[PDB]
């Protein structure tokens, strides 16, 4: 039924892929956790890791096989993955209160949450002997051309996938399974283009999509924006931060700002894209010596999430972002990394498309942009723990 289907797949796998799958079957948790946060290190750090080979073999084995139609998958998810820190119900309780249901409902009202790791799923709804570790059950519809690896584990045909998308929850209801209340969510995948570590692919895509962008620029404003981004971007941003047009109005810098905005507005981004930026404490209203900047202790992260997660954002100046997610020596101290999803059609441009040292895979966004923070999560970077913020740009 599925035993010969699992066989026909494993037969055509490599011996290295087979031993990688076995090592996953033995120590799945650590491998999944590593795959979640693997792309936020240095270029050479991710190369010398003693677990990168396993990740590469597993991702190749998964992506070898793809599906041709959308289909639904079923799994249990921890409710804190959707930025709900409270408990829906304890593991021994049997009933879910209406207040908890409502709190979970307005927690996930209009948001997108990103999933970036290996996962073990099922193609059939949970039954009787199936493990039910969380009070949240997910009905997710996968898109076409997504990879699944059906492997037998102690007879049970299990399925393994890798997540590279962001999901949104449409409707939630309360159901009963074996005398226990569960929250059942219907979710859908929102496709996006994400170059995590392979900056080569992102650079090639940006070149192909924005090397002709300069041609559409009128030459005077082209040289004007070019001279800005070489020498005067710091001055323009500093003038914008101090609310210069309102406090000390002057047309000399307002002309530069208008030219930059128009040039960025000329050609928008054609596809949903994700960019990574390392943010400083002054952006969040903190100082380098503030005690809360130390994320080793739990209370600092808890307070930061309580005061920032789910709220809005506003950057009067321009935002400098890079396609890649690897750590750079220019912002090594920055403990806060910002993950931004760019909706299709939003203003922006690939600065590094033009020849010369335009930056490090630089992508610029229009000033005055607003952001919404969906979820905030933490990962350990050597002897210190850095903090990851997931956000969506709104028009």
């Amino acid at each position: 039924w599925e035993r010969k289907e699992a066989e026909r797949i494993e037969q055509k796998l490599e011996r290295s892929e087979k031993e990688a799958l076995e090592s996953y079957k033995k120590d799945s948790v650590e491998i999944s956790k590593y795959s979640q946060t693997r792309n936020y290190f240095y270029d050479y750090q991710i190369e010398a890791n003693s677990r990168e080979k396993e990740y590469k073999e597993l991702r190749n084995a998964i992506s070898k096989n793809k599906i041709d139609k959308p289909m639904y998958v079923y799994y249990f998810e921890s409710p804190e993955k959707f930025a709900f820190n409270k408990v829906i119900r304890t593991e021994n309780q049997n009933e879910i209160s209406l207040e908890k249901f409502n709190e979970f409902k307005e927690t996930i009202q209009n948001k997108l949450f990103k999933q970036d790791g290996f996962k073990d799923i099922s193609l059939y709804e949970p039954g009787k002997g199936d493990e039910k570790p969380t009070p949240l059950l997910m009905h997710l519809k996968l898109p076409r051309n997504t990879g699944m690896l059906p492997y037998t584990n102690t007879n049970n045909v299990s399925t393994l996938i890798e997540q590279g998308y962001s999901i949104k929850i449409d409707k939630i209801v309360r159901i009963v399974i074996d005398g226990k209340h569960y929250i059942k969510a219907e979710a859908s995948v929102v496709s996006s283009l994400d170059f995590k570590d392979d900056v080569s692919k992102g650079d090639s895509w940006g070149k192909a999509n924005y090397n002709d962008w300069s041609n559409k620029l009128t030459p005077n404003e082209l040289a004007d924006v070019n001279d800005y981004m070489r020498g005067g971007y710091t001055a323009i941003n500093n003038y914008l931060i101090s609310n210069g047009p309102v406090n000390n109005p002057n047309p000399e810098l307002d002309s530069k700002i208008t030219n930059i905005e128009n040039a960025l507005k000329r050609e928008p981004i054609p596809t949903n894209l994700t960019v990574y930026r390392r943010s400083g404490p002054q952006e969040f209203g903190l100082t380098l010596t503030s005690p809360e900047y130390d994320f080793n202790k739990l209370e600092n992260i808890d307070a930061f999430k309580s005061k920032w997660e789910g709220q809005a954002l506003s950057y009067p100046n321009f935002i400098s972002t890079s396609i890649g997610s690897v750590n750079m020596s220019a912002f090594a101290k920055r403990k806060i990394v910002l993950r931004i999803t760019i909706p299709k059609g939003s203003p922006g441009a690939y600065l590094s498309a033009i020849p010369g040292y335009a930056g490090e895979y630089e992508v610029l966004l229009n000033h005055g942009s607003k952001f919404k923070i969906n979820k905030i999560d933490s990962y350990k970077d050597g002897t210190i723990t850095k903090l990851i913020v997931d956000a969506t740009l709104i028009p």
């Binding site: 139609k69 289909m71 193609l123 059939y124």
Partner: protein, 48 residues
């Protein structure tokens, strides 16, 4: 799971007794065709 009609492993005998237990039987005879039906009935002794 792939969206294909599977027939092996599905047996009406697993459901015959359960359908007969909770239903009433109605037959219409006419002259050229006969029709037999089962319609679900309510158990008034069970509040649930």
């Amino acid at each position: 799971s792939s969206g294909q009609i599977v027939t092996e492993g599905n047996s009406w005998s697993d459901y015959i007794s359960q359908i007969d237990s909770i239903s009433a039987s109605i037959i219409l005879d006419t002259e050229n065709e006969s029709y037999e039906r089962r319609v679900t009935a309510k158990n008034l002794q069970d509040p649930e």
